[PDB]
Write a protein of this length. Structure first.
Length: 279
């Protein structure tokens, strides 16, 4: 399948070269997979989700996304126009309030929730979790992300946005999950992207168009935006049978575009997520 005039990040993850604008992908499109977006919520009523999104847990007085960030990330995973995996099922877990903030204990509870709740959901092709959040190093937060991964969920986490080594941030620094840095449309590391040996992969993160609350769209930047490209890619590849939740991060790294990014510090992987799709 081909989606013309796609957002640059979708085109990038289906291309061996920067500078193209069509997204190419197998029409299975993540059907039969599920992606949990652990964030500020998801505006599931947005036409872009087509009934495929639903809120399943909140830790606040409402499940509404009053911020937009979670809706944007969910859109990059799985919206019809802005998403990598256009037929996946999206589940919202609101661990962040409408200011984008959350206590570490709430974030941990949300991760443990997903590890259990996936047993209540029909996801025969596999389960992914997208975590576009973080803060300072916490062994408890890392342990929770490791538990979620070990339960059979592909965990993709943002590296963080401090132009610093991700080893000092959580859950970015947990080795067993998939830690995602950000790149721009000219194949440069995004200026804010964290780096370091703990990174597994880069995805598009600068000027990413996706869904927003109020039935709208907008372009924003962050490792928060790179993470759902990788989560959606994992769901897409799991639906194709090419990998599993336990192996998908390694598979994405093995099949990535290699050596194409600039401003990668020595010791950080130079790997850009790529779907390897051949029409």
């Amino acid at each position: 399948a081909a989606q013309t005039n796609a957002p640059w990040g979708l085109a990038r993850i289906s291309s061996t070269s920067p500078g193209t604008s069509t997204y190419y992908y197998d029409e299975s499109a993540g059907q039969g997979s599920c992606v949990y977006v652990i964030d500020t919520g998801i505006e599931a009523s947005h036409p872009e989700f087509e009934g495929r999104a639903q809120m399943v847990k909140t830790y606040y007085y409402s499940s509404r996304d009053g911020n937009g960030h979670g809706t944007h990330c969910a859109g990059t995973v799985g919206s019809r126009t802005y998403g990598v995996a256009k037929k996946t099922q999206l589940f919202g877990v609101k661990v962040l309030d409408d200011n984008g903030s959350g206590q570490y204990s709430t974030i941990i509870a949300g991760m443990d929730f997903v590890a259990s709740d996936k047993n209540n959901r029909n996801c025969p092709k596999g389960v992914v979790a997208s975590l576009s959040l973080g803060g300072g190093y916490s062994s408890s937060v890392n342990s929770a992300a490791a538990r979620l991964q070990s339960s059979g969920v592909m965990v993709a986490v943002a590296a963080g946005n401090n132009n610093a080594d991700a080893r000092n941030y959580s859950p970015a620094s947990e080795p067993s999950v998939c830690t995602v840095g950000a790149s721009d449309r000219y194949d440069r590391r995004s200026s804010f992207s964290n780096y370091g040996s703990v990174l597994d992969i880069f995805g598009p993160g600068t000027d990413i168009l996706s869904t927003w609350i109020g039935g709208s769209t907008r372009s924003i930047s962050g490792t928060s935006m790179a993470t759902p490209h990788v989560a959606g890619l994992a769901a897409y590849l799991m639906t194709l049978g090419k990998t599993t939740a336990a192996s998908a991060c390694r598979y994405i790294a093995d099949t990535a575009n290699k050596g194409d990014l600039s401003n990668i510090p020595f010791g950080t992987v130079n790997l850009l997520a790529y779907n390897n799709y051949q029409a």
